[PDB]
Design an enzyme around this catalytic site. Sequence first.
Site, PDB file in Angstrom:
ATOM      1  CG  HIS A 174      -0.587   0.218   2.514  1.00 23.50           C
ATOM      2  ND1 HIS A 174      -0.236   1.477   2.993  1.00 23.50           N
ATOM      3  CD2 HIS A 174      -0.528  -0.664   3.542  1.00 23.50           C
ATOM      4  CE1 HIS A 174       0.081   1.307   4.269  1.00 23.50           C
ATOM      5  NE2 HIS A 174      -0.089   0.040   4.651  1.00 23.50           N
TER       6      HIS A 174
ATOM      7  N   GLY B 162       2.370   6.015  10.337  1.00 25.25           N
ATOM      8  CA  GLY B 162       3.794   5.966  10.031  1.00 25.25           C
ATOM      9  C   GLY B 162       4.457   4.678  10.503  1.00 25.25           C
TER      10      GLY B 162
ATOM     11  CB  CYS C 229       2.541   0.990   7.493  1.00 27.27           C
ATOM     12  SG  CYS C 229       0.798   1.336   7.832  1.00 27.27           S
TER      13      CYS C 229
END
Lengths: 305, 297
Positions: free
Chosen positions: A41, A143, A145
């Site tokens: 993503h 942030g 991820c």
Amino acid sequence: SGFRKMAFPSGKVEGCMVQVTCGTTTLNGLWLDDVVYCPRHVICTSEDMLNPNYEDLLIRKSNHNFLVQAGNVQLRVIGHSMQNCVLKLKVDTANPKTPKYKFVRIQPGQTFSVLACYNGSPSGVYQCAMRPNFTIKGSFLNGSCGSVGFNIDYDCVSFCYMHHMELPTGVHAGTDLEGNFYGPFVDRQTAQAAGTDTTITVNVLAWLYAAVINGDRWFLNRFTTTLNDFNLVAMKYNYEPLTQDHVDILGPLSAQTGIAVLDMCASLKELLQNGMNGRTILGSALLEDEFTPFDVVRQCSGVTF
Amino acid sequence: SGFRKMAFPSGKVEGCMVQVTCGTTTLNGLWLDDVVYCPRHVICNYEDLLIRKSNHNFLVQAGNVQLRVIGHSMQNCVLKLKVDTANPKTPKYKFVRIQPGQTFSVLACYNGSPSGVYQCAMRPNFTIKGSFLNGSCGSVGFNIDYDCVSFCYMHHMELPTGVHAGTDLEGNFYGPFVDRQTAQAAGTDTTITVNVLAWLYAAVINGDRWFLNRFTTTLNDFNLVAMKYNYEPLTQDHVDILGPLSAQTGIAVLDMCASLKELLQNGMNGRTILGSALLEDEFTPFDVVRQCSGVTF
Ligand SMILES: O=C(Cc1cccc(Cl)c1)Nc1cnc2ccccn12
Ligand SMILES: O=C(Cc1cccc(Cl)c1)Nc1cnc2ccccn12
Ligand SMILES: [Cl-]
């Protein structure tokens, strides 16, 4: 003596964390040898997330669109491929700090350490478990991820989780390091909710054995139970069914303390019925389910008090 | 979202852990530059016991490499072993003495090999509720501020109640403890009030507001209540330190104190706060601000 939620030393994992940027998005990546692993993503906009066509978004990208930063050094991307929900970025430099590692897919009830990162920089380490509903009750902000979950039994790092998203209830969802999600989740902004969660019964029993090892027996009783009668009661308190595999796995702790698994099950039935009555077990007023039978054996002494 | 007992990343500390052996005893040491720091009870009047030891009696092992001891000296309850090799993995560091109520990460080691990391607090009775087994002596406590590791604790002993006692890195014990086999006990403990309030603010930040009420209190009235429940006195310094969290949530410190007074007199009534049925006191106000902001190292 003592019983803490203990995480593995994070040093071997810290030396693999990098920052991955694509357009406006910035998240974390795992740099092992000459490949950087990160959530796919990272190629999406917030609009794209409703119904993203990752294959279509990826074909439009070139190697130089992905900016990878290891400390204060820019890494050059020389290739890219997608494997399920993970993006694999081939880089021109192999990580000299790459440890001995394996990619492992864990089952619900399993525990692991999470090294929470922001901008390719580690901020904290904590211990958690894969819930029966395949979510994790983590501590993550935007942030985070790309932050990973791991175990370090011996000197080999077993990577088992990569962080992808936060669900509306504040719980977290992610994939194994091959990009396959845990649970019926998708890396899409669609109506997704965690299923009803249950208590990890085999873990609560392990923690009751840890309390006995540390000298506490107030919760034990003179009763026993059949496995079936225990499960008929456990289901009513939203506890996971206890299988014969769980009973076998609790064997060593049963032998070390002299308390049979089904007698420990009778004590759990009673605790569920009565509550703690102003008492605690290992400094806790609730029944703890994020320590597995293996974590108890690893942390506790081999000599019962 | 989420609120966990979070420890600092331990990597900078892992690169300093060594194994120290003297006679039959084996424990952990902290190797910084060309000096290895370890508890002085590894030699077991400590000056009389030490004068009888030579450099070659101390066996120091860093991974699978033997380090050569070229000197030794004692500073309070810590033994400083001079070695011939400076640690190439020595980080930027300071030795700091912490106060009760302050928190830190512990890297528990056995045979100079780190096995786990956990977060804990220096209790008001100067003990720590840690998780240690025999062989854990020499394990250290630390904080990280930017890129600098602040070493604040070195493990020495377990008390009869299962709690732990140790020193700062200059060898001075926290609490009225001595490094000898004698009748020693932890004093009566109290709850770290400023930390429970910080954790109540963390619960509000994470969407838990059931314990909030319309009431406020005075510092004087609250301190009478707190003293009745074995809670540490709340000072004006604590009130000032909780200022930022008070501004972020819109709940005045004495407004949150009236909530704590109600929880202390009435209990939780079948409810939990941040997945806990007890009031948690091992998160300082700075820990709450750091975890609810994502500060990195
Ligand atoms: O949830 C997302 C973005 C996102 C939306 C939809 C699908 C996917 Cl795969 C990702 N990011 C994120 C991860 N953890 C947190 C904690 C807090 C806020 C944001 N967080
Ligand atoms: O307490 C001692 C031995 C000792 C005896 C007398 C004085 C001194 Cl300073 C040390 N060792 C120790 C440390 N932590 C643990 C955990 C468990 C068991 C033993 N532990
Ligand atoms: Cl598993």
